[PDB]
């Protein structure tokens, strides 16, 4: 949802929602930094 509204043209997602995604993906999901790099590549590949 958040990567879909704050999307601009698709995969171009800025750096405030990467780490806002992190504290919710660290809070709701409890994830790291580098596994988070893989899940953000999957999030922009899905968002692509």
């Amino acid at each position: 949802a958040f990567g879909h509204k704050y999307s601009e043209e698709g995969g171009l997602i800025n750096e405030s929602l990467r780490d806002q995604l992190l504290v919710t993906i660290q809070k709701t999901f409890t994830y790291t930094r580098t596994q988070a790099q893989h899940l953000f590549i999957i999030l922009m590949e899905c968002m692509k």
Binding site: S16, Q20, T24, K27
Partner: peptide
Amino acid sequence: LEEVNEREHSMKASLQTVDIRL
């Protein structure tokens, strides 16, 4: 009330990011 809800959602996300900044 709908304005208050959307704005409070934005404020809560900013507060969680502020906690991340600490």
